[PDB]
Design a protein around this ligand. Structure first.
Ligand code: NA
Length: 52
C-alpha cells in the first residue's frame, strides 16, 4: 500500500516506536506502519516530529 499525507494517528505511532527502538532501525519501525517504508518514517521524524 501507498499512503500520502500523514495523519495524527500515524505521527503518534512514530513517536512511540522511536521511543521503543530509537531514532534508527527505521526498517523495523516501518514494519508497524502500513503504507510506509523506512525512509518515510525517518524523514517524518527529522523534518517534522523532532526538528533541529
Ligand atoms: Na510499512
Amino acid at each position: 500500500l501507498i499512503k500520502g499525507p500523514w495523519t495524527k494517528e500515524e505521527d503518534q505511532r512514530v513517536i512511540k516506536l522511536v521511543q521503543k527502538y530509537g531514532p534508527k532501525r527505521w526498517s523495523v519501525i516501518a514494519k508497524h506502519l502500513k503504507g510506509r517504508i523506512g525512509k518515510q518514517c525517518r524523514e517524518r521524524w527529522h523534518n517534522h516530529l523532532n526538528p533541529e
